[PDB]
Design a protein around this ligand. Sequence first.
Ligand SMILES: Nc1ncnc2c1ncn2[C@@H]1O[C@H](COP(=O)(O)O)[C@@H](O)[C@H]1O
Ligand SMILES: Nc1ncnc2c1ncn2[C@@H]1O[C@H](COP(=O)(O)O)[C@@H](O)[C@H]1O
Lengths: 276, 276
Amino acid sequence: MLRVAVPNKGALSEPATEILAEAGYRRRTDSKDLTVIDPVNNVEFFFLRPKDIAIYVGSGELDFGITGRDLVCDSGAQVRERLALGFGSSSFRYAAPAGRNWTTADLAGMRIATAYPNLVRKDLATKGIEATVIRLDGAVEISVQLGVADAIADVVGSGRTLSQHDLVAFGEPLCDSEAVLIERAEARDQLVARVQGVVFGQQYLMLDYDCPRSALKKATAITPGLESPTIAPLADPDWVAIRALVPRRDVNGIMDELAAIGAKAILASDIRFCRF
Amino acid sequence: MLRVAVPNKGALSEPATEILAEAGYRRRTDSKDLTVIDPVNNVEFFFLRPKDIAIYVGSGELDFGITGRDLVCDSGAQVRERLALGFGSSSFRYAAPAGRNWTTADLAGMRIATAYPNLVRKDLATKGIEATVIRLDGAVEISVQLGVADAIADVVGSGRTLSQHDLVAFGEPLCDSEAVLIERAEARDQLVARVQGVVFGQQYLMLDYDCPRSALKKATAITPGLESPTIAPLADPDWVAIRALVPRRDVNGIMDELAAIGAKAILASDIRFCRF
Ligand SMILES: Nc1ncnc2c1ncn2[C@@H]1O[C@H](COP(=O)(O)O)[C@@H](O)[C@H]1O
Ligand SMILES: Nc1ncnc2c1ncn2[C@@H]1O[C@H](COP(=O)(O)O)[C@@H](O)[C@H]1O
């Protein structure tokens, strides 16, 4: 029996639910229900406050959780980070009023507002800088305008929020975060393998294309696949169909290369999961 | 120019907006806008995270805030509590698995989950009890079931949430909370007076009733009003109309008493605000 924590709301919740569904686990279909019992897989899913997931895994009975690396860092929980899941990427930055040459040294003795004060205190300590870290619940940007803080430390996605409050990021990031599968410090191995199959498989597309036999050597070099491309005859003896897994991020350039050597009906399909 | 913080969401937000509107301040009509400029009254309203209001008032440029007494306590902010506003009442309690004789002494060495850890640590210190306080973002009840904590400390309204998670409250309350108007440690006096007028006035109804002249002494004793009841003749010389402010909570018993001495057309009306 495994117990897995999943963010109940926020930007990580849907993608986390999707990755688990993709791995074959039962979905939360009625969204107002905080628990999902998966008899088939013998897993119980608990839909918890995003901020709290790491504590539940590190100090509770939960075997795994999906949450953000920054939140794990801020929680102080001792958990194993097993996989980065391919969503929820962001960078955590210090920021202060725009138009000034803020650098890390300026942080000394500042009041720094943040919703991740442990993460911020640890970063300052590493830098050898003393400052006054002020915990806020969120929406931290407005704290500078309203006189609570001199600077902030917060998640930076597009950077839109900072610009909207006339703030500019400075310094190296405090954390480069991504959603992660964390495990409490055979059943467990199965779940990690299944989630890994989705993480890995979502990076590829399956490419199928018709190729003239005269172009087969060239095509084989363009799409080597994970082991070696699959080659099957067409009814027309002068042609074959080739199948190869290709990185999702290179598929267009690959299609262009194949078209240039005479490939036809070049198509891509999604895969659910893949074990190398 | 005054700056006032108002909860942007949660159970205190609507009543806080209403009390300010009742006091004559400009309403937030477009709810998605975090600021409201009130040129007429020279007040700017900032709609902030409920948890953060006390820090903004205590350490920021905000002159006042409406928030909960428990949140002020947990914030550690040094602010003046000027008025209790008549809404948001609750009690903060320790709770643990139902069916057992939990008492305060049992808390020693326990892991106690709560979203108000400062409030809880101060209460434990007063009691001379050491324990491990675990900060959670909210939805703390499930923490006992999931093995993160032995007990919780949380707001108790109806008590429904505790019962739903098989928990029972024990011990004296850690705080008896209510929504409050807090001020940073002539313009300010005006705002307090105006909010006070609403707080005070909302406790009364204005009662008007027709009364036979033969019953006037008895009626006067039943409704003495705040100074003395207003008495005005009706067109019918054998009658008068009496007006008196009466506590909202006693109005029905008062109406019964008046009806028993022959009063007719006994009615109550709301008032907006009242200065004693
Ligand atoms: N704590 C967070 N965890 C994951 N993504 C976030 C977080 N905070 C902000 N983002 C994302 O960052 C994107 C834009 O970044 P920004 O304009 O800097 O706020 C938004 O679409 C958010 O979904
Ligand atoms: N932090 C809070 N501040 C003000 N009211 C609250 C708070 N938490 C819960 N309540 C109220 O308490 C009521 C019911 O209490 P309970 O079943 O004990 O959760 C709910 O209708 C809530 O609006």
